[PDB]
Ligand binder design. Structure first.
Ligand SMILES: *[C@@H]1O[C@H](CO)[C@@H](O[C@@H]2O[C@H](CO)[C@@H](O)[C@H](O)[C@H]2NC(C)=O)[C@H](O)[C@H]1NC(C)=O
Ligand SMILES: *[C@@H]1O[C@H](CO)[C@@H](O[C@@H]2O[C@H](CO)[C@@H](O)[C@H](O)[C@H]2NC(C)=O)[C@H](O)[C@H]1NC(C)=O
Ligand code: NAG
Ligand code: NAG
Lengths: 99, 105
């Protein structure tokens, strides 16, 4: 009884083609990029992936910003708790505000 | 500029464009190792200055990140920070002192 604009676009010759990569294949690429970053770091962007523990490659990344790596190993639990709280706050911000 | 660690590049002229030849560095042959963040020695924690601690099953070395080059762990390539009661994964190994054979001789 209530006709939408899609049928008017449809009957007047205006169609929409589907994308080549569906939303499931984008998530597989995203999962591959996530599992390569966590388990290997930046070594999967150059050649083959080289495994390294996460608490050691974060000490690799404090050395990039000018902080010695004892700061991580003496404050590992605090940084882990701060990251978990940041991810929880990101969840709350995305589930609260739609703008 | 290329896949890997960039080294150089060379330009070549083309019709209505340019062509770059990016020379890069790609690691080739890999081996598994046993690693540790720090070493407990005489109640002290030793962290590597530049490199990573690895082991070949029995002994412990220090090795640069992008190439395998094991060295004997001394006080020249390590620095001390804190104690052994705060680092997760700290192992027990000795650290060589270069002044001891000079003082003994
Ligand atoms: C650096 O800042 C952090 C805040 O992220 C401090 O961590 C908090 O410390 C208080 C101490 O009373 C605890 O009650 C909180 O639970 C801690 N927050 C956590 C674990 O997320 C940290 O103490 C500060 N470092 C200092 C003051 O040396
Ligand atoms: C791990 O590496 C060390 C250092 O190269 C090896 O220790 C030496 O091995 C050679 C060859 O067997 C011996 O001749 C030496 O006497 C060893 N000691 C020293 C102080 O040089 C060790 O054998 C290696 N272990 C494994 C499992 O490969
Ligand atoms: C290291 O160990 C893993 C464990 O399964 C194995 O698959 C791999 O072939 C080993 N070697 C390298 C170079 O990763
Ligand atoms: C290293 O040695 C200390 C005593 O010198 C001991 O308490 C500790 O358990 C040892 N580390 C491991 C991993 O066994």
């Amino acid at each position: 009884a209530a006709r939408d604009l899609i049928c008017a676009q449809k009957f007047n010759g205006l169609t929409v083609l589907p994308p080549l990569l569906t939303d499931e294949m984008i998530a597989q690429y995203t999962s591959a990029l996530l599992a390569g970053t966590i388990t290997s770091g930046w070594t999967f962007g150059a050649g083959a992936a080289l495994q390294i523990p996460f608490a050691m490659q974060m000490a690799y990344r404090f050395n990039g910003i000018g902080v010695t790596q004892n700061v991580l190993y003496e404050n590992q639990k605090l940084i882990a708790n701060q990251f978990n709280s940041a991810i929880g706050k990101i969840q709350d911000s995305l589930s609260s505000t739609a703008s | 500029c290329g896949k890997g660690y960039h080294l150089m590049s060379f330009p070549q002229s083309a019709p209505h464009g340019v062509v770059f030849l990016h020379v890069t560095y790609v690691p080739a042959q890999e081996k598994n190792f046993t690693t540790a963040p720090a070493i407990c020695h005489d109640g002290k924690a030793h962290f590597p200055r530049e490199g990573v601690f690895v082991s070949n099953g029995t002994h412990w070395f220090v090795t640069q990140r992008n190439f395998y080059e094991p060295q004997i762990i001394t006080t020249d390539n390590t620095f001390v920070s804190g104690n052994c009661d705060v680092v997760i994964g700290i192992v027990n190994n000795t650290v060589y002192d270069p002044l001891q054979p000079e003082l003994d001789s």
